[PDB]
C-alpha cells in the first residue's frame, strides 16, 4: 500500500521521548466514556514538544 | 477390533489385555463398572500409576504433551484414562489422538470412556491403526424387552430373589437408567438382607420409584383415575418438577393417542394398535384410553394444552400447575 | 421466655440419635443395616431440600462409623468419640461448606489429606456439604480422589441441588434421596421439641409454621425460634399470624366471596385496602382468575384441592359448593375481558375497579339497580 | 453466494442512491427496505465498495487500487459487518459495541469509515439503542447501511435517524420474463411464485431451487383429499418441515384465492391449482372459510414470532379446530381489539 | 441570572426532628415506644410505595440512636453525630447499594467487617436499601448475622416489594409498612413548604398537584418545583394546569353530557374549542374515561366524588340519576376501545372525534337516524 | 478538503439557543425561568417521543448551566464552554448511552467518577440517554447518586418512553414531557429552514411532509432529505407524493364506495390496479379511514361537508345519505383493526386484502 505523507516530521533523542512518556503515561484514561480521553495529546509549537494526558481527575503536561 | 458386551468383557480381561481400551455408551453404570474392572485387572497385573484426564474444548495440546511425557519410563507399569466431549472427537483432538496412537507400550494401559460416535469418527486413521490393538465395549441402554431378564440376572449376581410382581414393579418404575435399577436393588437388599423380594415389601419404598414424570400421572388419565394422577401432579409440584418437561411428555404422548383415536371407526382396534408399533403393555391401557375419551374430549384437551403452552412460553407462566391439573381433570372424564 | 437464645432450636435439636430423626426411615434403616452388616461404601451422597437432615444424617453416620464401641448402627452418644463430634470438634472428621470453598487450591489441600491415616478414629471422614458450588476442576479432583480411595477413606456428600453435579461424580457415589418432610412430620417433630422444652404452645400455630417452612425442618425451627423470641417464649397463633400471614398474600378470597355475594360496600373496602398496601393490579386480576378457575374446576371432582391450599379449604369447599358453573363461566369471561381492558384504562386501579363493577352489574342473582 | 448476485432491475435505484453520495450530500445513514432475497444485499455491497474505494470511478468503484482490493479480500480495516453468528439468530450488544468503540478512531486508509448492518430486524433492541448514538451523530466520513424486510417492526427510534429508501419489486411481466429465462416451467408456477413471494424474484428462485416447491405440490395433493372428505388432520405431515410459516402462508394464500373466487375476482394468486381453488370454494362456507383463514394466519404469526414454540402442538390444535369448524353449529371468531 | 440560591425542596425539607414526618403514625409510634422503652430489634424492614419517607425515617432513627449520648425518643439537641448524619458525613452510618453487592462474596465482605463498632458512636447502622434484589446466597450469608448479631450493630433494610425477598428474612425481626400519603396530607405539606419560602400559592394549584402526586411527597415536590420553575417563583392555577396538560374537567364534563344528550353539533363545538385550547387528545380521552368511571362509581356510593369534585358533584348526581348503568358501561367500552386504537387512527383528533361519533351512533336510547 | 463539509439537516439545524427551539414553550419557559431565578434541580428527566428535542433541550440546558458568564438562561454561544458543549468535546458533559453502560462495572465506574471535582465547568453533568433500559441493578446502584449528589453534579436523563423507568427513578427527577410537535409548527420550521438554505419549495409539499411524520421534527427533516435526494435537489408536491406513494381521495373513495355496496369484484380489481401502480398500503388504509371519518361527520351535522378538496363531494354526500351510521362504524372498525395488523400480515398487500374482504362481510 502507498504510504501516507506526513504533515509533522521531526527527530528526537530517546532520552527526551522517554522522559515525556514517563512524565505523562500514568495520566491517560482507560476505556473511559469520553472517547477522546483514552490517549495522549502530542502538541508541537516553535521548537517545543508538549505532551498532555488527562482522565478527568488528573493532568500531566510535559514540555521539552 | 474386538467389539464386546459389558458382561463378556471380564472373560476377555482374564484371557489377555489390550494396550488401548474404548468405552462407548450413554449408560454410565456399565461405563464405570467396566472402567474400574479393567483398572483392578491392571492393578492385579502390577499397574500402579493411574492418570485420568478430562478432555474438553478447553483441553488442547498443552493439556496433552504432559500425557505424552508421562508414559515413557518412570516405574513398573501405569494406566491412563480420558474423558471425551459430548459430540465425540473433534478436529482439535483428531490430531491429538493420532499422536497418542504413535506410542503404545505395556508400561501404559490406555482407557477411553465416551458415548456413541459418528461413523465418520471411527473412519479416521487413528481408529484404524488402533483396531487390532484396542477393544471396544458397547455401553448403550438397550430396549425394555430384555430389561426384565437383565434385571433378574443382575439381582441374581446381587443375590436377590425377586418375585414376578416385584420384577414387574421394579422394571415399570425405573425405565430411565441402570443407575436407578442399581440403587433400587441395593436399597432393597440392604433393607431386606434375606433377599426375598415380596411385592408388599417392594411397593413401600418411598413411592413408585420417584415422583418421575410419565408413568402413573399419564396412566391414571389413561384409565381415567382423577385422584391418582392429581396427587402425582401435586407431588411433582411439591418437588418442583419442571413444567416444560411435563408439557413435552404430554405433547409426545397425546399425539400418539390422537393418532390411535382416528381410524377406529373404519378399522378394528388391534390393527391400529399394531400399525403404530406401540408397546403392548401400553396398548392394554391405550384400549380404555380410546374407549373413554371421545374425539371432542381430545379436541378440548389439545386446545387447552395449546393455550397453556402458549401462555407459558412468553414468560407469563400463568399458574402452569392449575392448567396442568385442568388437563388432568379433563382427561379423567 | 429466653428459651433457645442459648441454642437455636436447629442447633439445639440436632439429632444425636436415630430415634431423634423423625422421617427418612427408608434411609435410616438402610444406614443401620449397612453399618451392622458391614456393607459400607467408600462414598455416600444424600439429596434433600434445605433443612431435610443431610448434615444430621451425615454426622450420625460419622458417629456410627467411628464410635468407640466400633462400627455400630446405634451410637452411644456419650463416648469421647461421640462427644467430640457432638461438640463439633473431631480431629478425623473434616466438615466443609462448599459455598465459600470453590477454589482448586483448598480442594487440593484436602486432596493431600485423603492419604494419611486417621489420628483418632478408624476412618477419615471428609463431609462436603452443598457440593454443587465446587468448580469443574475441583469436581475433577474429587473424582480423582473417588476412583482410588484408601481403606480409611469415607466420603459423605450432601447438597440441596444434586443435579448440578457432573455425571461422573453422581455415577461414582451411591445416592440416597431424602423425601421432603411432610407438613405432618414437621408438625409432629415441632410438637415433640416444644413439649420436651416445657413451653406452652398451640396446635394451629405449629401447623402454620410447618406450612410456612415448606418442608425444611431447620427453617421451621428457625421460624419457631423467631416466634418464641417475638412472643417472649410463648407460642400463640396470634403472633404466628402477625409474623407470617402479614408477609403472605391473603386476598381474592374475600374479593371473590363478596363479588359472588354482591356486597358492593365490602368489595369497595377490599379494593381500598388493596390499593393501600401498594400491590399490583394485574397480579391481583391473575390471582382472582386463578381462584375462580380453581373454584369452578373443583366442581369437576372434589379431590381437585392439594395441600397448596391448606388455608383455603375451609372457604374453598363452602364457596365451590354454593355456586353454579354457568355463573362462574360468566364471571371468568368478565374478568378476562377486564384484564384485556386493564392497560388502556385511566389507572390500573380504576380499570380493575370498573371490571369489578361490570361483574356486579351483570350479577345474575342480584342485578344492578336501574332507575 | 460469492459476492452474492447482481439483479438487472436494481441498476436504476443504485444510480439514484449513488448520486446523493457523488454530490457529497449523502445522509450518513440509510435504511434500505427490501423483501427477502430481493437483492438489497448486492446494493449495500456495491455502495460500500464505491464509498470506501480511494479513487471512486464515475458510477463505478475503482477499476484498480488497494483500497478496495482489501475489500475484495473481505479484510478492510474500516468496513465492518454486523450479522448474527452462524450458530445464533440475535445480534448482541457486544458486536455493535466493538464496532462503535472502534469507530471513534480515525480512518486507517485515509478514506471513509463505512459500517453495515446485515439485517436490522435481527438487531436486539438493546443493540439498537447502543447503535442509536452512532447512527444519529457519527464522526466525519462515517456512513451506514441497513436492510429490512419491513421497517415498521423496527424500533421507533432507529428508523427515525435513517432515510427509508425503498426497493420496488420489478414489474410483473419483467419479473416473469427474468424468471422464465432463469428457470424453465409453466407460467402458472411462476405467477404463483411471484405473487406468493410478494413480488421478490429472488424469493421465487429460492422457492424453485429449494425443495419447498415439491413440498408445496405435496400440500396441494393432500388438500385434494382433505377438502372433499373433511379430513384435514392428514395435512400434519405436509405442514411440518421447519417451514410452518411458509407452508401456512401457502395455505392462507389458497384460502384467499377461494374467498376471492366467491366474490368473483379477475385475478387470483394460485393459478397453478384452479381446480383446487374451485373445490375449496365449493365445499367451504364463506364465514367458515374466513374464520379458518384467520386461524391459519394467526398460527403462522404465532410460529414466526415466538421461537421455541412447539410446532407440532400448534399445528395439531389448528387442524383440530378447523375440523371442529367444518361441523355445523359452531360459532366462529371475529377479529377485534 | 446567576445565583447561589435553591436547595431543592426535596433536598431541603427532609424531616430531621420527628416532627416533619407526615403520616405514617404507626411506624413513628412504634419507633418512639421502642426507643423510650429501650427495646430495639436487630433488623428493621421499612416497606411501602415510592416517595413516602422510608429513607428519611431510617436516617431519623439512625441519628436518634447515636446523638451525644442519651436514649431519647428522637428529640436530641446539639447532637454532633446527628448533624454529620444530616450533612452526609458518615458517622457509623453505612448506606449500601445492594445492587453493587448482589454476589455472595460481597455480602461475605459485608459480614466480616461487623466488629468495627467504636467509630465516634455507639451503634453502627447498615442501610441495605432496595434489599429485595439480593441473591439467595447473599440472603443466607446475611441471615447468620441476622439471627444473632453483635449488640452494637443494627440492621435497617429498606425495600419497595416485600413479596420478592425470601420469607425467612421477612420474618426475622420486624416489618413496618408506610402507606401512601393522602392528597390531603400532600396539600398540607406543599402549602407549609411554600409558606416557609415566602412564595404565594393558589389552593387550586395545591389540590391539582396533590392529586397529580401519586401519594408520594417526592413526586409532589418534584412537580411543585417544576411549577415554580414554570412560573416565576409563584404557582398559579393556569400555569399548573398547562404544566400537567390536563384540560378543563368541565370541558370534558360538557362533552360527556353532550354525548349523553345526543347533540352531535355541541360535541363538535366542544371538541374544536378544545382543539383551539391546545390539549392532548389522549389526555381528553383519558379524562373522559375517568369521568365515566366516576359516574359508574356514584352508582354504588355517593362518596365516590373527591373533595375537589364538589365543584361538579351536582352534575355527577344528575348524570347518575339520569343514565342507567348499562349505558354507562356501553359508553365506557366504546371509549376504552377508542383509546386502544387511538395510536392507529389517522390523526389523534380524527380518532377521538370518530370514537365520540360512534358512541353517539350506537346510542342506546336515541341513536343517529339512518 | 474531502472531509464532507456538508452536514445533514437533522443535525446541522440543531437548536443552539432557547430562542431557536420549535415549540415546547411549556418546558422552555420553565427551564429558562429556573435558570434565571436561582432554582436549579439536580436531576432532569426529559421524556417524549422520537424527534421532539429531549437531547437538544438538555444540551442547551448544559450550555447555560456551566457557562462562565454566571449561570444564565441565555448561553452566550461564543465562549469556550458553549463551543465545546456544542461540539461535544467538553470534559464535564459526559454522554452515557444506557444501552451499553448497563453492567454493574460501568455503573460502579460512574459512581466512582461522581465523587471528584470538575475540570473546566462549574458543573459536571452526565447526559444519560435511553435510560429506560438500564438493568435493574444499574438503576438500584444509581439511586444514591440520583438522589443526593455533591454540589457540582447534575443529571440530565433522556428517555424515549417513561414507562420502562422504575417509578422510583421517575420520582427523584424532574419530569419534562416534551409534547409532539404540531403539524403547523413543523411546517413553519420547515419553511424557515428551507428559505434559509436557499432551497425552492412550495407549501403543499411542506404540509404533506408534516402529515407523514407523526409529530417528529427530525423525521420531518429526514423526509426532507429523502425528498431532496430524489427530484433534483428541490421539494415539490409531485416529488413528495411519489416519495410517500400517497394517493388522491378519488381512488380511496372508489374503494370505499365499491366496498360499501358489496361490489367485491370491483374492490379486488381496484386493489389489483393499486398494486400495479405500487402504492403504499398503509396509505390506502389511512385514506379510507379519513373518508369514512368525513362521511361520519357529514352524517352527524350537514354543515361539516367535505370541503377541504370538495372535488367529488357529491359522492361523499350521496354515500352519507344512503348508508346508516352503524354500517359506516363497522366499516371503520374493520378497516382500523386490519390496519393494526399490517405488520403481522405475511404480506402488506395480502393483509389489506384480508381486511377489505372481511369488510365485504355485511351482506
Ligand atoms: N429428618 C430430621 N429429623 C429430625 N430433625 C431434623 C430432620 N431434618 C432436619 N432436622 C432439624 O434441622 C436441624 C438442621 O438439620 P440439617 O440436617 O443440618 O439440615 P441440612 O439438610 O440442610 O444440612 C437439625 O438440627 C434438626 O433439628
Ligand atoms: N413523611 C414525609 N415527611 C416529610 N417529607 C417527606 C415525607 N415523605 C417524603 N418526603 C419528601 O420527599 C423527599 C424524599 O423522600 P424519600 O424519603 O426519599 O421517599 P422514598 O420513600 O421514595 O425514598 C424528602 O426530602 C421529603 O421532602
Ligand atoms: N423543539 C425543537 N425545536 C427545533 N428543532 C427540533 C426540536 N425538536 C427536534 N428538533 C429537530 O430534531 C433534531 C433532533 O432533535 P433531538 O433533540 O435529538 O430529539 P431527541 O429528543 O429525540 O434526541 C434536531 O436536530 C432538530 O432539527
Ligand atoms: F444444611 Be442445609 F443444606 F440447609
Ligand atoms: F425511594 Be423513593 F421511591 F423515591
Ligand atoms: F430521538 Be430522540 F432522542 F428520542
Ligand atoms: Mg447442612
Ligand atoms: Mg429513596
Ligand atoms: Mg436523542
Ligand atoms: Zn460413641
Ligand atoms: Zn478500488
Ligand atoms: Zn441526637
Ligand atoms: Zn457561553
DSSP F226-252: HHHHTTTT---HHHHHHHHT---HHHH
Question: Closest approach of chain F CAs to the CA of A22, in angstroms?
Answer: 23
Strand partners, C155: C43, C126
Residue F96 maps to a domain: yes
The angle formed by the CA atoms of residues C111, C116 and C118, to the nearest 5 degrees, is 115
Cβ F75 under 6 angstroms from ligand 6: no
Residue C316's CB is within 10 A of a number of other CB atoms, namely 18
C165 in the same domain as C30? yes
The structure's method of determination equals: cryo-EM
Query: Residue F285 falls within a domain, yes or no?
Result: yes
User: Is the residue at E138 inside a domain?
Assistant: yes
**How is residue B135 written as a grid cell?**
477393544
Residue F1, domain member (yes or no) = no
* Å between F37 CA and nearest CA of chain D: 34
Closest alpha carbon to D28 in D12, D51, D50: D51
Positive or negative, the CA dihedral E193, E198, E199, E201 is positive
CA F70–ligand 13 middle distance (angstroms)? 9
Final residue before a domain boundary, out of C181, C203, C224: C181
Domain membership of residue E1 (yes or no) is: no
Q: Within 13 A of D91's CA, how many CA atoms are on the CB side?
A: 24
Q: How far is F91 from chain A (nearest CA, A)?
A: 7
CA atoms within 13 A on the CB side of C109: 8
* Contact assessment for residue F98 and residue D102, using Cβ atoms and an 8 Å cutoff: no
Whether C270 and C288 have beta carbons less than 8 Å apart is answered as no
- Hey, is the C-beta of F101 within 8 angstroms of any chain A C-beta? yes
Neighbours of C326 (CB within 10 A): 9
Collect all residues with Cβ–Cβ distance below 8 Å to B11 and sequence separation of at least 6. none
Are C98 and C133 within 8 A, CB to CB? yes
Q: Do the domain assignments include residue C1?
A: no
As a whole number of angstroms, the distance between CA B215 and CA B238 comes to: 17
- The C-alpha torsion from F303 through F306 and F311 to F315, rounded to 10°, is -90
Residue of D141, D287, D335 with shortest CB distance to F3: D141
Whether residues F265 and F314 share a domain: the answer is yes
Q: Are residues C173 and C193 in the same domain?
A: no
Residue C264 near ligand 1, beta carbon < 6 Å: no
Question: Ligand 4 centroid vs C218 CA: distance in angstroms?
Answer: 8
Q: Is D74 left (phi over 0), alpha (psi -120 to 50) or beta?
A: left
Q: In Å, what resolution does this model reach?
A: 3.9
Nearest of D178, D174, D179, D153 to residue D164 by alpha carbon: D153
Per the annotation, does C54 bind a ligand? yes
CA gap D191, D177 in Å, rounded: 11
> CA D41, D43, D48 angle in degrees (round to 5)?
95
Interface B:D, ≥3 CB–CB pairs < 8 Å: yes
Q: Are F189 and F114 part of one and the same domain?
A: no
Q: How far apart are CA D149 and CA D34, in angstroms?
A: 5
Smallest Cβ–Cβ distance between C148 and the set B50, B187, B333 belongs to B50
What is the distance between the alpha carbons of residues C6 and C11, in angstroms, rounded to a whole number? 10
Residues E214 and E134 in one domain: no
Closest approach atom of ligand 4 to CA C218: 4
F314 and F169 within one domain: no
Interface probe for D, chosen from B251, B306, B311, B327 (most Cβ of D below 10 Å), is B306
CA-atom Rg of chain B in angstroms: 25
E28: enclosing H helix or E strand = helix E25-37
Are residues E173 and E259 both part of a single domain?
no
Q: Are residues F104 and F212 in the same domain?
A: no
Q: Is F179 touching A (CB cutoff 8 A)?
A: no
- The number of residues in chain F equals 363
Does one domain contain both C167 and C117? yes
Question: Does the annotation list C348 as a binding residue?
Answer: no
Count of structural domains, chain C: 3
Look up cell 457509623; give the residue: E92
Q: CA E10 → CA D103, D320, E15, E93, E204, distances in Å?
A: 42, 62, 10, 21, 22
Q: Which chain D residues are within 8 Å of F267, Cβ to Cβ?
A: 263
State which residues form the domain around F254: 246-363
Question: What is the domain-level CATH number for residue C109?
Answer: 3.40.50.300
Q: Is residue E347 part of a domain?
A: yes
Residue E278 grid cell: 391546545
- Among F181, F197, F219, the domain boundary falls at F181
Residue B305 · residue D326 · CB < 8 Å: no
How far, in Å, CA of C67 to CA of C62, rounded? 8
CB contact under 8 A, D297 and F229: no
Ramachandran angles phi, psi of D54, nearest 5°: -65, -40
- Give me the count of residues in chain B: 333
CB F241 within 8 A of CB F33: no
> Cα separation of B218 and C155, whole Å?
39
Burial class (CB in 10 A: 0-12, 13-18, 19+), D125: middle
Looking at the structure, do residues C177 and C323 belong to the same domain, yes or no?
no
Look-up of cell digits 365490602: C266
Residue count of chain C: 371
Q: What is the spatial distance between Cα E213 and Cα E224, in angstroms, rounded to a whole number?
A: 10
Nearest to D286 by CA among D332, D336, D226: D332
Residue F35, C-beta contacts closer than 8 angstroms, at least 6 positions apart: E1, F61, F64, F65, F71, F72, F73
Tell me whether A56 touches chain F (CB under 8 Å): yes
- Do β-strands E176-178 and E43-48 pair in parallel, antiparallel, or remain unpaired? parallel
φ and ψ at D80, to 5 degrees? -120, 140
Residue with CA at minimum distance from ligand 6 atom 1: F50
- B26 to B178, C7, C144: CA distances (angstroms): 11, 49, 21
* Residue closest by Cα to atom 2 of ligand 6: F50
CA distance to partner chain C, nearest, from residue B283 (Å): 27
C124 three-class SS: strand
Q: Shortest CB distance from A34 goes to which of F94, F101, F117?
A: F94
CA distance C166 to C159: 13
Question: In this structure, is residue F324 part of a structural domain?
Answer: yes
Question: What distance, in Å, lies between the first and last C-alpha atoms of chain B?
Answer: 58
Q: Is C106 left (phi over 0), alpha (psi -120 to 50) or beta?
A: alpha
Whether F24 is in the pocket of ligand 3, judged by its Cβ within 6 Å, is yes
F16 and F162, same domain (yes or no): yes
> Minimal CA–CA distance to F118: which of F154, F84, F85, F144?
F154
Tell me, yes or no, whether E24 and E121 share the same domain. Answer: yes
Q: How far apart are CA E338 and CA E359, in angstroms?
A: 10
Query: What's C251's domain CATH number?
Result: 1.20.272.10
Residue F31 DSSP label:
H
Q: Which of C148, C181, C214 finishes a domain?
A: C181
Decide: C135 and C103 in contact? Cβ < 8 Å: yes
Amino acid at each position: 500500500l502507498d504510504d501516507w505523507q506526513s504533515e509533522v516530521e521531526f527527530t528526537l533523542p530517546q532520552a527526551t521521548m522517554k522522559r515525556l512518556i514517563e512524565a505523562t503515561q500514568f495520566s491517560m484514561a482507560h476505556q473511559d466514556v469520553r472517547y477522546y480521553l483514552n490517549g495522549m495529546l502530542f502538541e508541537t509549537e516553535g521548537e517545543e514538544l508538549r505532551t498532555v494526558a488527562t482522565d478527568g481527575h488528573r493532568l500531566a503536561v510535559c514540555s521539552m | 477390533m474386538i467389539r464386546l458386551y459389558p458382561e463378556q468383557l471380564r472373560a476377555q480381561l482374564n484371557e489377555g489385555l489390550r494396550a488401548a481400551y474404548l468405552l462407548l455408551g450413554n449408560d454410565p453404570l456399565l461405563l464405570q463398572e467396566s472402567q474400574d474392572a479393567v483398572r483392578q485387572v491392571a492393578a492385579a497385573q502390577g499397574f500402579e500409576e493411574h492418570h485420568t484426564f478430562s478432555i474438553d474444548p478447553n483441553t488442547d495440546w498443552n493439556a496433552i504433551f504432559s500425557l505424552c511425557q508421562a508414559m515413557s519410563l518412570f516405574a513398573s507399569r501405569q494406566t491412563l484414562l480420558l474423558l471425551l466431549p459430548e459430540n465425540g472427537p473433534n478436529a482439535a483432538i483428531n490430531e491429538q489422538l493420532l499422536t497418542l496412537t504413535g506410542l503404545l507400550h505395556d508400561d501404559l494401559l490406555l482407557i477411553v470412556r465416551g458415548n456413541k460416535l459418528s461413523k465418520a469418527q471411527e473412519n479416521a486413521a487413528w481408529f484404524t491403526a488402533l483396531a487390532n490393538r484396542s477393544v471396544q465395549v458397547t455401553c448403550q441402554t438397550p430396549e425394555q424387552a430384555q430389561l426384565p431378564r437383565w434385571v433378574a440376572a443382575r439381582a441374581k449376581q446381587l443375590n436377590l430373589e425377586l418375585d414376578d410382581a416385584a420384577n414387574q414393579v421394579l422394571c415399570y418404575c425405573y425405565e430411565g437408567n441402570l443407575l436407578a435399577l442399581a440403587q433400587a436393588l441395593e436399597r432393597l437388599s440392604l433393607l431386606w438382607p434375606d433377599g426375598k423380594l415380596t411385592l408388599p415389601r417392594v411397593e413401600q419404598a418411598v413411592n413408585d420409584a420417584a415422583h418421575f414424570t410419565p408413568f402413573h400421572w399419564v396412566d391414571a388419565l389413561l384409565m381415567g383415575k382423577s385422584k391418582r394422577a392429581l396427587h402425582i401432579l401435586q407431588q411433582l409440584r411439591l418437588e418442583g418438577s419442571e413444567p416444560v418437561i411435563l408439557l413435552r411428555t404430554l405433547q409426545r404422548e397425546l399425539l400418539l393417542l390422537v393418532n390411535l383415536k382416528r381410524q377406529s371407526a373404519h378399522t378394528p382396534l388391534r390393527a391400529l394398535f399394531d400399525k403404530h408399533r406401540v408397546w403392548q403393555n401400553r396398548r392394554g391401557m391405550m384400549g380404555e384410553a380410546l374407549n373413554r375419551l371421545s374425539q371432542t374430549q381430545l379436541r378440548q384437551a389439545v386446545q387447552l394444552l395449546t393455550r397453556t403452552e402458549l401462555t407459558l412460553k412468553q414468560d407469563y407462566g400463568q399458574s402452569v400447575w392449575a392448567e396442568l391439573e385442568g388437563l388432568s381433570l379433563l382427561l379423567c372424564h | 421466655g429466653p428459651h433457645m437464645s442459648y441454642q437455636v432450636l436447629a442447633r439445639k435439636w440436632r439429632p444425636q440419635t436415630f430415634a431423634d430423626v423423625v422421617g427418612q426411615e427408608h434411609v435410616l434403616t438402610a444406614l443401620a443395616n449397612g453399618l451392622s452388616l458391614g456393607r459400607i461404601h467408600h462414598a455416600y451422597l444424600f439429596s434433600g431440600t434445605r433443612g431435610v437432615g443431610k448434615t444430621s444424617i451425615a454426622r450420625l453416620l460419622a458417629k456410627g462409623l467411628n464410635c468407640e464401641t466400633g462400627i455400630t448402627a446405634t451410637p452411644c452418644g456419650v463416648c469421647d468419640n461421640c462427644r467430640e463430634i457432638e461438640q463439633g470438634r473431631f480431629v478425623d472428621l473434616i466438615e466443609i461448606d462448599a459455598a465459600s470453598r470453590t477454589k482448586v487450591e483448598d480442594t487440593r489441600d484436602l486432596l493431600d489429606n485423603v492419604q494419611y491415616a486417621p489420628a483418632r478414629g478408624r476412618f477419615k471422614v471428609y463431609l462436603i456439604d452443598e457440593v454443587h458450588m465446587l468448580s469443574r476442576h475441583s469436581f475433577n479432583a474429587l473424582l480423582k480422589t473417588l476412583e482410588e480411595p484408601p481403606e480409611h477413606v469415607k466420603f459423605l456428600l450432601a447438597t440441596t441441588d444434586p443435579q448440578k453435579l457432573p455425571v461422573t461424580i453422581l455415577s461414582r457415589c451411591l445416592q440416597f434421596h431424602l423425601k421432603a418432610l411432610d407438613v405432618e412430620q414437621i408438625r409432629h417433630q415441632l410438637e415433640h421439641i416444644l413439649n420436651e422444652e416445657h413451653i406452652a404452645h398451640e396446635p394451629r400455630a405449629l401447623q402454620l409454621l410447618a406450612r410456612a417452612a415448606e418442608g425444611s425442618l431447620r427453617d421451621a425451627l428457625s421460624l419457631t425460634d423467631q416466634a418464641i423470641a417475638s412472643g417472649d417464649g410463648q407460642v400463640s397463633t396470634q403472633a404466628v399470624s402477625a409474623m407470617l400471614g402479614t408477609l403472605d398474600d391473603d386476598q381474592a378470597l374475600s374479593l371473590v366471596e363478596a363479588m359472588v355475594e354482591a356486597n358492593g360496600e365490602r368489595v369497595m373496602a377490599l379494593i381500598n385496602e388493596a390499593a393501600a398496601r401498594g400491590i399490583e393490579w394485574e397480579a391481583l386480576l391473575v390471582e382472582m382468575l386463578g381462584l375462580l378457575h380453581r373454584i369452578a374446576m373443583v366442581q369437576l371432582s372434589p379431590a381437585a384441592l392439594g395441600n397448596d391450599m391448606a388455608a383455603i379449604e375451609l372457604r374453598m369447599r363452602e364457596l365451590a359448593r354454593t355456586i353454579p358453573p354457568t355463573d362462574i363461566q360468566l364471571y371468568y369471561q368478565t374478568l378476562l375481558i377486564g384484564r384485556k381492558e386493564l392497560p388502556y384504562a385511566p389507572d390500573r386501579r380504576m380499570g380493575v375497579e370498573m371490571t369489578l363493577l361490570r361483574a356486579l352489574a351483570f350479577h345474575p342473582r342480584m342485578p344492578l339497580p336501574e332507575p | 453466494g460469492p459476492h452474492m448476485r447482481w439483479y438487472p432491475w436494481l441498476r436504476p435505484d443504485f444510480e439514484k442512491l449513488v448520486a446523493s453520495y457523488q454530490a457529497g450530500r449523502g445522509h450518513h445513514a440509510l435504511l434500505i427496505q427490501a423483501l427477502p432475497g430481493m437483492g438489497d444485499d448486492a446494493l449495500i455491497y456495491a455502495l460500500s465498495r464505491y464509498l470506501l474505494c480511494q479513487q471512486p470511478q464515475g458510477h463505478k468503484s475503482c477499476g484498480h487500487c488497494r483500497g478496495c482490493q482489501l475489500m475484495q479480500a473481505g479484510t478492510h480495516p474500516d468496513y465492518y459487518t454486523l450479522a448474527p453468528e452462524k450458530g445464533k439468530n440475535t445480534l448482541g450488544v457486544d458486536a455493535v459495541r466493538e464496532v462503535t468503540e472502534k469507530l471513534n478512531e480515525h480512518a486507517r486508509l485515509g478514506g471513509a469509515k463505512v459500517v453495515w448492518v446485515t439485517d436490522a430486524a435481527l438487531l436486539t433492541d438493546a443493540a439498537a439503542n447502543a447503535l442509536l448514538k452512532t447512527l444519529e451523530e457519527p464522526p466525519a466520513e462515517t456512513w451506514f447501511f441497513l436492510a429490512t424486510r419491513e421497517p415498521e417492526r423496527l424500533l421507533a427510534t432507529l428508523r427515525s435517524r435513517c432515510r427509508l429508501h425503498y426497493l420496488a419489486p420489478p414489474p410483473e411481466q419483467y419479473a416473469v420474463t427474468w424468471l422464465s429465462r432463469e428457470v424453465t416451467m409453466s407460467q402458472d408456477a411462476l405467477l404463483a411464485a411471484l405473487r406468493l413471494s410478494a413480488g421478490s424474484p429472488g424469493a421465487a428462485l429460492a422457492l424453485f431451487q429449494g425443495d419447498n416447491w415439491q413440498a408445496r405440490e405435496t400440500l396441494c395433493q393432500a388438500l385434494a383429499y382433505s377438502v372433499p372428505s373433511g379430513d384435514w388432520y392428514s395435512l400434519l405431515a405436509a405442514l411440518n418441515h421447519e417451514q410452518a410459516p411458509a407452508r401456512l402462508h401457502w395455505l392462507a394464500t389458497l384460502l384467499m384465492d377461494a374467498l376471492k373466487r366467491h366474490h368473483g375476482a379477475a385475478q387470483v394468486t394460485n393459478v397453478d391449482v384452479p381446480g383446487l381453488v374451485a373445490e375449496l370454494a365449493n365445499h367451504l362456507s364463506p364465514s367458515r372459510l374466513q374464520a379458518i383463514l384467520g386461524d391459519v394466519c394467526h398460527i403462522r404469526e404465532q410460529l414466526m414470532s415466538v421461537t421455541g414454540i412447539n410446532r407440532e402442538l400448534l399445528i395439531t390444535d389448528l387442524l383440530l379446530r378447523i375440523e371442529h369448524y367444518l361441523q355445523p353449529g359452531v360459532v366462529l371468531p371475529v377479529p377485534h381489539l
